[PDB]
């Protein structure tokens, strides 16, 4: 069934890459899907050469899956990733702004306090927090990126150019688009909050749960809501920010091997996936969180026949990327 050129980022994912590659081989028949491994520099890379088919899948987040479809990718979402459980397979998850207990501030009161985010075009860590606080930052808010820098005290925007825009990097220098950057990510972001870098870490509702395993330590954080509010980690589904579509891998329109890619990840979900195996493992690993999936995925499913980004995104997250990338005040 040929293989899969899988595009890694950075060295922790391209040695997860590896993994998979060889412990596919090991069981899945010589006549089966295997894996082969492209490590890039960032998912903007990955993105450059699938399109240039030097690659074909790359698992990205909504937003970043909404810019891949734009010209001159034109890039499509393949196989999506379900989070909760196998019995009731979530394909969306929620965007929360996680703080420190006792740090003293709402949401209307992030002005002036430092931020760390996933990364820069992400739902959770950009997208959605920075949809709703648009018109709180000031003037010019043209170009985004600026703005943002001027409302927070400092910030770290993984992916963000640390020339043009410093402050974006003030927790992070350099704004590395990738593992290496100890801030990059869901628990990156967390990391910058927990060291005392940031006041606010833009992440996801499981985040945090993948970093303290004691509810001890859980209960000196809590979740900024939008009635301007506080309420405890455990409490997300009543105090996120949004909910937002689930991270998808993306594959070309033609010679995409999108049936190939699903049969791979298929055959993977049910060697490696959840429990299945003490060999390897597809959602979590030895060297780091979210390697090519997210750790807090449960599973795989295929995207409809032909479906293109706006669709498979849908049109509620397709409008507030539309109106962040727009939108007045
Ligand atoms: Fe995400
Ligand atoms: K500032």
Known sequence: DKTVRWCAVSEHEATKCQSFRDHMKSVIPSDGPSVACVKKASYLDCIRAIAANEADAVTLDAGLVYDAYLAPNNLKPVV????????????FYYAVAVVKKDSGFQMNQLRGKKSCHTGLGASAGWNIPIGLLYCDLPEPRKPLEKAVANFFSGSCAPCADGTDFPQLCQLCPGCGCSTLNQY???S???????DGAGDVAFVKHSTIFENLANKADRDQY????????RKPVDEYKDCHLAQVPSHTVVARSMGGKEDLIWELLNQ???????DKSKEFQLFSSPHG???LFKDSAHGFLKVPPRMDAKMYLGYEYVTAIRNLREGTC
């Open 188 to 194: 990156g972001a967390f990391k910058c909050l927990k």
């Open 222 to 229: 809590e979740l900024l809501c939008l009635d301007n509010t």
């Open 268 to 274: 993977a979900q049910e060697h490696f996936g959840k």
């Open 80 to 91: 999506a990733e379900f989070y909760g459980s196998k019995e009731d397979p979530q394909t």
């Open 289 to 291: 969180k979210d390697l």
């Open 184 to 186: 990059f990510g869901y």
